[PDB]
Structure formats: C-alpha cells, structure tokens
C-alpha cells in the first residue's frame, strides 16, 4: 500500500495473509468471507509467466494479524487449505480477466475480535455504492513504494496498512492504460487534478476493496486487488476485480462444496 497509514487493531478482521510454507514469504492478501472460505486473486496461485502454480499444500493462510512479520501468538490463527478453486475462465494470458479464486480451509476458523468475515455485495448494495467518486478502503502488507533501484529505504511495512480511495469512472480508467479492460474490473484512485496520492502495489493482490453501507452499517467486499502499472504513478489508477459481477461463480462453488 503506497501512501497509506498503519491500520488500527481489529479494523479489518476479514484481512487474511497468504503465506508460503517454503521459502517463508508473504505471497498475497486475502479476505475471510465465511468460516471455511477465503477469497483472493487467482494470480496469487497461478501465473505461468512467472512461474507460479501452487498446490494446496504449499501455503498457509494466517488470519487475525497486525504484524507483518511476527508470529502473533494467541492472536492470529493459522489455517491449512483443503482445496483451491480458480475461476475456470481466469485469463492470465492477457489482462487478468476474472482474477478471483476461493480457498476452502481444512477446518472452520473460530471468530474473535480479530477474525470476522466481510459481506459480499448484493444487487442493491452494488448499485447503491459502486459509483464514481465514492471511496472504498484497501489493506495489505504489500510494498510501500513501487520497486526501483533508486529507492532509498524500507519498502516494507511492519504492520498492516490502510488507504481509502475513490472509485473512478470507466472511461477514465479505460483511457489511462493500454491493457484491455473488461467489465469484471474496476479502477480506483485520485485523479490527476486532485493532486493526492495513494494506491495498492505489489504484494497487496488478493486483498479486499471494501465499502461501508450507510444503509445498514455493514462493510461489503467490493473488489480484489488485481493489477496496475507501477504503483502510485501519475495518470494511472489500480484495478480491482469486480466481485459483484462474479458473485454467481462464487455462490456456486460455495454451494456445491
């Protein structure tokens, strides 16, 4: 998260950490949508161009954390995966279309003050809230700055980061990049003229884009961090997987398994 702040404790109890058993490494971010399911970006699991094709047995999911690096004894809960489900039409080949994936824990996680799921938007929330100019939040332990030889400094955060950003209009999104965009994606970020900063960045993929509902006091998960071109660049916005759009796939896996 570029230009965010530390998160406060229990601010995002649905934030999950995708961690590698070996070598120990943060792979990505995820979201707790229920007690036996986590949502994340497919590209965290499968990206051939970079050689990623992980099995259930190569990862762990850590829920309840604040520290990035510490083992939060008695706070976090570490879970094993039972199975991974990638949208069958996920396109790693070109634009990352349909970059979403569910994971099924081996055993249900117990909720606490630090672990609690997020809701998934319905038609009505979706239409009320995903509108241009409206702000959502993004969290992650991803990089703090876009990677560059010339960066002097820690590029890593020591505690979860937060950043609120406004959702942008399709046409502005579509014109800012040359990657082919689809309706399954949304872009969020300050426009050139609002002269402000903030963004997701590498290592934040899989994390939730959430919005809070004035209509009911609940936080809904609106998007998944998916891609971008650099981090915080001028005239650029980051892309998120449109969760509502793909809710049907989501319900189906969750209902057969």
């Amino acid at each position: 998260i570029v230009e965010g702040s530390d998160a406060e404790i229990g601010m995002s109890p649905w934030q999950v950490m995708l961690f590698r058993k070996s070598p120990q490494e943060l792979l990505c971010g995820a979201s707790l949508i229920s007690d036996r399911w986590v949502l994340t970006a497919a590209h965290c699991l499968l990206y051939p161009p970079w050689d990623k094709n992980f099995t259930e047995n190569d990862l762990l999911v850590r829920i309840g954390k604040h520290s990035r690096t510490r083992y939060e004894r008695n706070i976090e809960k570490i879970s094993m995966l039972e199975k991974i489900y990638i949208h069958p039409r996920y396109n790693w080949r070109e634009n990352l279309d349909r970059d979403i994936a569910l994971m099924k824990l081996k055993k249900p996680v117990a909720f606490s003050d630090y672990i609690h799921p997020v809701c998934l938007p319905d038609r009505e929330t979706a239409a009320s809230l995903l509108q241009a100019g409206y702000k959502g939040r993004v969290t992650g332990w991803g990089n703090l700055k876009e990677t560059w030889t010339a960066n002097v400094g820690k590029g890593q955060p020591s505690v979860l980061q937060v950043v609120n950003l406004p959702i942008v209009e399709r046409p502005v999104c579509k014109d800012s990049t040359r990657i082919r965009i689809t309706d399954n994606m949304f872009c969020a970020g300050y426009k050139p003229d609002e002269g402000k900063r903030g963004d997701a960045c590498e290592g934040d993929s899989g994390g939730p884009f959430v919005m809070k509902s004035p209509f009911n006091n609940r936080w809904y998960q609106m998007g998944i961090v998916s891609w971008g071109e650099g981090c915080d660049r001028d005239g650029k916005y980051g892309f998120y997987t449109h969760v509502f759009r793909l809710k049907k796939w989501i319900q189906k896996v969750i209902d057969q398994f």
């Binding site: 702040s5 406060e8 601010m11 799921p117 609120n164």
Partner: peptide, 28 residues
C-alpha cells in the same frame, strides 16, 4: 454469514475508526 461486516471492536461497540467518516462523506 448473518453477522458479516460488523466489526467486534468497532460496530459492535458503537466505535468509529480513525478514517471511516471520510468514506461516508464521499457518499454525500
């Protein structure tokens, strides 16, 4: 889940985060 989206330490206790109002104000 039935209790989704309500945070134990915020919502469930009528407590506010250092930055959520900025979220709501954009809805206006």
């Amino acid at each position: 889940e039935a209790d989704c989206g309500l945070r134990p330490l915020f919502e469930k206790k009528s407590l506010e985060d250092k930055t959520e109002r900025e979220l709501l104000e954009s809805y206006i």
